[PDB]
Structure 1
Amino acid sequence: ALSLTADQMVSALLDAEPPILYSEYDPTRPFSEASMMGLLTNLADRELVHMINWAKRVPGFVDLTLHDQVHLLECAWLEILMIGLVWRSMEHPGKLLFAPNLLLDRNQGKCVEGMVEIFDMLLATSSRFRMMNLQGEEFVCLKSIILLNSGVYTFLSSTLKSLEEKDHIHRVLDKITDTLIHLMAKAGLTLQQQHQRLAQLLLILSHIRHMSNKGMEHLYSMKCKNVVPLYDLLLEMLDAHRLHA
């Protein structure tokens, strides 16, 4: 993503966006009978498949080794789901738009032990986004930064290959920084407002990390899923042949 213009990065990222999926419950049937966590887990599993396709279209990602791609997604997948949730919840004060047919308030989260704490964090993030007037162009930049950043400090090694990979990633993160500043300049913010808004945006990423960690903690205490480790499922998805070319 190192010779692509800022305008080329932005349209690539807008072109790569995944679809908005629906919850799978029968809407002709009552609600007292649906497992909220089963509904949420099924939604999340379905989104993950589309996340892999998206990641492959983030400039620079597929130039990485397959191992490193798996590591980055293993590190970032919940941050990536959550920022997407807060983004589509932005125009819906007090509610989380998990899917177009599944819009939940905080009292619906009390439905699950320990879940209202996570709901409240997501809702607050959504409110911050709304107050900053975050733009779709800025959002796709931030989601790609999460992908490239969250796992880059935990690669074990420091083989020559590994050092080359880290370098490449930092290079791509740097172009996305240039892209966010370009977007802001185009919008006519001053120099000073650009850097202030860039910092405001990147500091929310620390909150998103916090919510992912808390949600991983919460998830690891119910039924959700942990059959076949995540790494292997990600590897299968990412390690594609080219036969269906």
Structure 2
Amino acid sequence: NSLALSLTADQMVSALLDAEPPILYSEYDPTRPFSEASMMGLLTNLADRELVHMINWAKRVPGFVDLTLHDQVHLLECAWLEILMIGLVWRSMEHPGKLLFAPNLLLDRNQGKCVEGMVEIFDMLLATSSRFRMMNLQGEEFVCLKSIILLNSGVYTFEEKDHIHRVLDKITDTLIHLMAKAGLTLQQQHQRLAQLLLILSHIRHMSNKGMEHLYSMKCKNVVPLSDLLLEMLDAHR
């Protein structure tokens, strides 16, 4: 029925690697001392442009096209902030103590104090980056985790449900195939699988706490939010 289940492990990895969105740049202004309104403007503008690439990255995820239009909308509405965060965390691996929102926008926890309530989200994001760096997370594992977020985070807020779970099982087979490829023993394979999937619980937590902060930003009306971001934000009520 669906061609995603017929792909092999390497073909699954290649399709996810080739689908990777590009690393966008922040607005050029050197700008570096920041205020609440200026930092929120740079991140909001960056997040709005990353969403356009994420939506096109989602259609390239094997099995995502097979869902109905409403099912695709629901999965992206619930996962979009998680996907932004895990990408930011992955970009910040090689920069301990820093968050790489863009190649020209590297911030630390001191700059998170400019925005009211963001320093808490910053520390959790930095902690996830240290966790990935301590685990030596590979890019093949990262694209698997990110697609798991897209398919799993909304599967329980809905025949069609068995499709997503079978695609989720495919990625699980792909993750194990990557770990057996790197020489990990059987005990190390299911242990590392568990460690990686448990971090998704914390990424969900960071997203929920992030949604609250972005909701108060709409009520503060300090920075005008784009209509696309407003629709993704109103989906969480």
- In the superposition, the TM-score normalised over structure 1's length comes to 0.87
Return the offset for 1:218.
Answer: 1.0
Question: 1:10-47 CA distances to partner (integer Å, 9 max, x unpaired)?
Answer: 00000000000011142388756971011111100110
Distance 1:143 1:231, change over 3 A: farther
Distance 1:204 1:8, change over 3 A: same
> How many pairs align?
234
**Aligned partners of 2:97, 2:71: CA distance in 1, in Å?**
38
Q: Quick check: 2:36–2:115 contact (8 Å CA) kept in 1?
A: no
**Aligned partners of 1:3, 1:100: CA distance in 2, in Å?**
37
Matched, 1:148 2:151: yes
Q: Quick check: 1:96–1:123 contact (8 Å CA) kept in 2?
A: yes
**Aligned partners of 1:59, 1:230: CA distance in 2, in Å?**
31
Distance 1:36 1:238, change over 3 A: closer
Return the offset for 1:227.
Answer: 14
Matched, 1:38 2:26: no
Question: 1:83-128 CA distances to partner (integer Å, 9 max, x unpaired)?
Answer: 0000000000000000000000000000011110000000000000
Distance 1:43 1:228, change over 3 A: closer
Matched, 1:91 2:91: no
Return the offset for 1:217.
Answer: 0.8
SS at match of 2:65: helix
Please report the RMSD computed on the Cα atoms of aligned residues, expressed in angstroms.
4.4
Distance 1:97 1:39, change over 3 A: same
Q: Quick check: 1:94–1:123 contact (8 Å CA) kept in 2?
A: yes
Aligned to 2:186: 191
After superposing the two structures, state which structure 1 stretch, 108-117 or 232-241, moved more.
232-241
Return the offset for 1:222.
Answer: 1.2
SS at match of 1:230: coil
SS at match of 1:110: helix
Return 5+ residue gaps in structure 2 as ranges: none
Matched-pair identity in % = 100
Distance 1:233 1:98, change over 3 A: closer
**Aligned partners of 1:121, 1:66: CA distance in 2, in Å?**
33
Distance 1:5 1:32, change over 3 A: same
Return 5+ residue gaps in structure 1 as ranges: 156-163
Distance 1:24 1:58, change over 3 A: same
Question: 1:161-191 CA distances to partner (integer Å, 9 max, x unpaired)?
Answer: xxx2211000000000000000000101001
After superposing the two structures, state which structure 1 stretch, 46-55 or 221-230, moved more.
221-230
Distance 1:239 1:29, change over 3 A: closer
Q: Quick check: 2:25–2:102 contact (8 Å CA) kept in 1?
A: yes
Return the offset for 1:147.
Answer: 0.2
**Aligned partners of 2:227, 2:54: CA distance in 1, in Å?**
16
Q: Quick check: 1:14–1:140 contact (8 Å CA) kept in 2?
A: yes
Q: Quick check: 1:72–1:148 contact (8 Å CA) kept in 2?
A: yes
Aligned to 2:7: 4
**Aligned partners of 1:229, 1:111: CA distance in 2, in Å?**
18
